[PDB]
Amino acid sequence: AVQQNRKSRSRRDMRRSHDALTENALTVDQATGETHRRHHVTKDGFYRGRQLFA
């Protein structure tokens, strides 16, 4: 139910050794030069040479 000894700072860091984040997959769109998330629409509404909300 609870620890019998306080965990040392070294073991705590060794547990967090798997906590790192990853970057996302970003691509530069060619029809706008923009950078967007891959397979995602841009915030301007562009995706693969197609426009939403002109």
């Binding site: 998330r37 397979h39 995602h40 629409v41 915030k43 995706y47 939403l52 909300f53 002109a54």
Partner: protein, 119 residues
Amino acid sequence: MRHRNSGVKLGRTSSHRKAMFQNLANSLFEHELIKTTLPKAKELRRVAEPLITLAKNDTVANRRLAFARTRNAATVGKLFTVLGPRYKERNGGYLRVLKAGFRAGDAAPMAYVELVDRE
């Protein structure tokens, strides 16, 4: 296990789920472009495309079926006068789903659902 099972849950009862997809389909047929969560958008295909397939042929029985599945008279009118005639020689694929980042308050992945030859 879940082997070969189809369908979603989305944390709702089946009554709530049926109602929510009815609402979503009505909204999409009215605006032709909506923003929703990505799993909702992917399940909305199996709900909204058979309605268009139904609206391809205009019979009183078909319009009554469309009303039983939408319960929205304006949606039925639009299906059988605009959307049905539009997708007459298109063999499926009336919706287009495009991933659209994440919601702010939620970090839930989002998607746009639009009709194919809209606007």
